[PDB]
């Protein structure tokens, strides 16, 4: 097989931002290795629901197959994880798309009786105890 | 947004139907209070 030498590094510094933009001096080893520890923590925290795990065992006491399959996250589609540094601020940009999104923001005749006489004439119980001769 | 809604409770019991009517009535009483 012919040798396809490293294309991306031949292109990066002059035509393409690397997968992250930060730079460092004397701490290249930490950041280069620590962000890699965070790329996958967040992936494995989102793509696998762990808030349901941290409840069951980490917390003391005083559905299961539904979670191991990650059925709740079947519509989740991450795109990237990004990192930055400036002004003492670490930053993270996470763009995620879902092809579906659920609703969570959430007997007529009974109205007609109590409002039959009109608009402002409501039928309270104290009226309907009565029976006019 | 902190002190706005209470004026609507106060200004009405005063003659001022709105907030600015307070200023319109207390123009000169308030003008003497200022010195520039």
């Amino acid at each position: 097989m012919g040798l396809k030498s490293l294309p991306m590094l031949n292109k990066s510094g002059i035509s393409m931002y690397w997968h992250n933009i930060w730079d460092s001096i004397k701490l290249y080893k930490k950041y280069s290795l620590s962000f890699l520890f965070l790329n996958e923590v967040i992936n494995h925290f989102l793509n696998e629901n762990l808030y349901y795990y941290c409840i069951m065992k980490i917390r003391p006491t005083d559905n299961i197959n539904k979670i191991k399959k990650s059925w709740n996250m079947r519509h989740f589609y991450l795109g990237k994880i990004l990192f930055l540094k400036y002004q003492g601020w670490v930053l993270v940009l996470i763009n995620y798309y879902c092809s579906r999104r659920n609703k969570l923001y959430i007997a007529f005749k009974k109205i007609a009786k109590s409002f039959r006489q009109g608009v402002t004439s409501y039928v309270y119980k104290m009226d309907k105890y009565k029976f006019k001769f | 947004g902190q002190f706005y809604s209470t004026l609507e409770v106060i200004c009405r019991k005063i003659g001022a139907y709105n907030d600015v009517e307070l200023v319109k009535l207390y123009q000169f009483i308030l003008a003497e209070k200022v010195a520039d």
Partner: protein, 119 residues
Amino acid sequence: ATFPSKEQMRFQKNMGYNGFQPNIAFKDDLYFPLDNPVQRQGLEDLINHIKVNPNLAIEGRGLCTILYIIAREGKDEPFIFKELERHLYKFKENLSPRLSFGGLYASYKSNLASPYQVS
């Protein structure tokens, strides 16, 4: 001979790397590391967040925890306690032991709490 040996396993313990502190949040209803100076500035912001906001909503946790820390650090705040004692009716006979310990612990040490607050 076994591997790892017990005398080895203490090395990783004495340095402290065997722990994972975010688990503590689920064990203790109050959790504020303050392991860094940035985290401490996060405390002072809360103290100014309250002085500026007269209209404010809470839960039983965030109230009691702030008092635990101000007591632990010893900061003087005659304005904070009167602002927060108003809501105490909201969580009568409801609070956890760990949280009930905090505001109790702070009401004594503050030398600023009310005789209603301690009650």
